[PDB]
Structures are given as structure tokens and as C-alpha cells.
Amino acid sequence: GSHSMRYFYTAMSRPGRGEPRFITVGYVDDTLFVRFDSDATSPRKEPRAPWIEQEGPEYWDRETQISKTNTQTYRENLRTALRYYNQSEAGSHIIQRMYGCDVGPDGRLLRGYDQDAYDGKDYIALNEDLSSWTAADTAAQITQRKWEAARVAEQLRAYLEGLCVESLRRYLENGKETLQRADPPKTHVTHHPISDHEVTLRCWALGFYPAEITLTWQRDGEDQTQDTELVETRPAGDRTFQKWAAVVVPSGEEQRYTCHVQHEGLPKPLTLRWEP
């Protein structure tokens, strides 16, 4: 199926408590495979997935260098961001970055990203054309002029179209046993009386991967969108995820409701009900 690789930067300043902490994590779909922490004893890129360990020693050193240089780049970016917003040097601030590429089954570039955020708000982002930028304000505009001058988009496009997809393609092969395996969810409905007139029906989905999934409750065939309680998908801790959709139905009308499940690990969308 489709796949994606993404890198996430987190540069948090901490006034009076040392230099800003820089963190990097690489993900392939919903799996984490690399991590860099400027706070670690020996700051360097470390493997987080079995299939990445087989990379040559040059790999790990090349990657660790990038992150080290980036540690400085973004620490400088945090200082620069302070001036752009006329902010004090006594407050803590955060810069976030998430970029990467998406590919279809044929492993071809589908889309590319590179977004930067400051204190949670959008700052600047590379447009889908991979050649133009979008500045959220006059401050990010300054950064845009710099990036256009230093031909940054050009460099990113090159990566996004070359190395990004190439390395991802290689990663998918080495970890095909897991990265290319979709585990369907395990489902069941629970019955929990709320009163003498209403009861709660909860549709569960467990041990599935990837995280993407769709749970819906239907009343006589009608989706109970604005009526269903849908908890945020959560990680089980074993690479798989969990999620449930609940709906309060009148007692004696439980058979008028049906739960629908959609996951790429299932050949056909599922449908279940309360099983007394």
C-alpha cells in the first residue's frame, strides 16, 4: 500500500537551564526507527527499529553529523526567532519541524512536506509544488527571503524526489516483515446499561496496525456521527493501536444499531452488533 517517512524536530529553549534541547525522530508510517537527543550522554543517531541496524557505520556517522549541525542551526533559529518577535530572553520557546515524503504502492513520489512551527503556530511551509513557500506572518517572511536567496526549496525538492524516496524504498524492503504487514483489528461490542431506559454499546478495535482506521455506529443504516463518542486512537505499546466508538441506545433497540470497521488489514469492511 501507500507509505511515508517523516522526520520530526523539536528545539526547546530553557533559559537558565542550559542550551536548547534538540530532538529528532524518524518515522516510517506509524513506526519509529531513529532518534537523536542533544541531551543524551553521547549525542548521536540511535536505531529504534530492528531493520535499521543493518545500515553501514558510515550511515550512522553521516546521519549523526547532520543532527549535530542541525542542533546548532535550530538553536540559532530560536535566537533569531526571538528577535523577529521582539520577545524576551527569559521565556521558554519551541520550534517544531516535520518534513518527509509520501509514496504510492509503486513506490513513486506522491507528495512532499516540510513545515516549521514556532510556539505551536504555523511559521513557514514548503508548498506542494516543492518550489514556493508560505509564510504565516511578516516574521516568517524574512526567513522566506533568506531561503529563496539560498535556494532552499531547490535543495529540498532534490532530496524529496531523490534520497527521500530512495531511502524509504530501501527501508520498506529491509523491514517488509513489519512495515509492509497490516494487522487487522480485533473487534467486539460490549453492553453496559446506563439506566432502566438506556444502555451503552461500545465497539472495540484492538491490536491493529497501522493507526489509520474508521469506526462508525449506524442506526437503521444511518450514521450516528453527531451522536457517537469516538475516543482518540491510542498505542497499545506493542506497535499496535486501539480505538473504540460508543453510542447510548434506548433499551430494547440494540439490534437497530450496527458498528462498521474500516482498516487496510481487512479485505472487506466489517459490520457487528451486540451479541447477547
Binding site: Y7, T24, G26, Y59, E63, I66, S67, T69, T73, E76, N77, T80, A81, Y84, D116, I142, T143, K146, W147, A150, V152, Q155, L156, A158, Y159, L163, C164, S167
Partner: peptide
């Protein structure tokens, strides 16, 4: 793999 590419604000 990450690219080099330096992005100074």
C-alpha cells in the same frame, strides 16, 4: 535518511 540542507531562519 535526512538531507544536509541548512535552513537558517
Amino acid at each position: 535518511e535526512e538531507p544536509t540542507v541548512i535552513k537558517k531562519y
